[PDB]
């Protein structure tokens, strides 16, 4: 009983607890790495979609002025004003970069 | 971009397996202690002389030379681990500086 | 009285758990990092092309 | 008097149940998550294209 209570009960069981503790810590750390990668992916996706929207806003006025061309009028105030709109749109987009 | 991921992937595994070999080492040392004092345990077939000459072997050979050699080998493992991690960190800087250097010129 | 065989085999299984999970995890993490850099590059090209047109 | 062999083998079968079911489940769950994100992206594209036409 001295061997049973000094060897296993004195040194082995706390070593088991220590190994278990390292397992817990590594588990927690890797789960944190997973949670970080989640944030990364979702932020990247949002960053892309927002830029897609911003581009399509310019594309709208672009195609609009393109069909405003085919009146065969270079003096159409609609066409001039849509051009003014597109200029300021491009200025505000470039100022963002 | 492929090797850019391969670098980090090997790096994390390196950092994990360093501590995992460290744990293996500490599980190994006390095993060798138990084996040494158990080999020194059954030397009681002689009188009191055979006891102390057995513990003399256990306390002079393993306790005197083997364990510091284990510590020295562990130290070399630590140093190489640190050096290789530094090499990884340097390669990171290299890749990112190259990418920035390219993109700036693209803009220009 | 010291089940050291069973002790060591337990430690083996315990370590083998973490080996397998590190092995499975870090590869996929590196795949993520690659895709992140690729999307970054695509983004840079697209924005650059737009700006240069504008 | 302590059927510890039978005890351990019982625990083995019990654990092996949950191993198999976790293994079968989580793959299909990840497939679902993928399809969810894909449908989301398709939705975003379709709505965007409509809005940009309108």
Residue numbers in the entry:
A (entry chain B): 196 to 292
B (entry chain C): 142 to 249
C (entry chain B), D (entry chain A): 34 to 87
The authors write:
E. coli cytolysin A (ClyA), also known as hemolysin (HlyE) or silent hemolysin A (SheA), belongs to the α-PFT class. ClyA is a 34 kDa soluble monomer, containing mainly α-helices with only one β-tongue that transforms into α-helical elements in the pore complexes. Each protomer in the ClyA pore complexes is composed of five α-helices, namely αA1, αB, αC, αF, and αG. Here we report the cryo-EM structures of ClyA pore complexes in the presence of n-Dodecyl-β-D-Maltoside (DDM) as dodecamer, tridecamer, and tetradecamer at the resolution of 2.8 Å, 3.2 Å and 4.3 Å, respectively.
